[PDB]
Amino acid sequence: MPLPPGWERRTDVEGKVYYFNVRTLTTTWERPTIILE
Known part of the structure; x- marks a missing residue:
């Protein structure tokens, strides 16, 4: 589960x-998925 650039935890x-x-x-309680659009 990679964190695409522009994601911080x-x-x-x-x-x-x-x-x-x-x-x-x-701000979300959702793990950075494989690309988010």
Whole structure:
């Protein structure tokens, strides 16, 4: 499960990891899939 450029994964104080699509500025609990359009 690769992370295409423009994807970052950040951990919150809760110990949770949220995924941020930097390209569209989206904060989601969805693992970076093989390309997202």
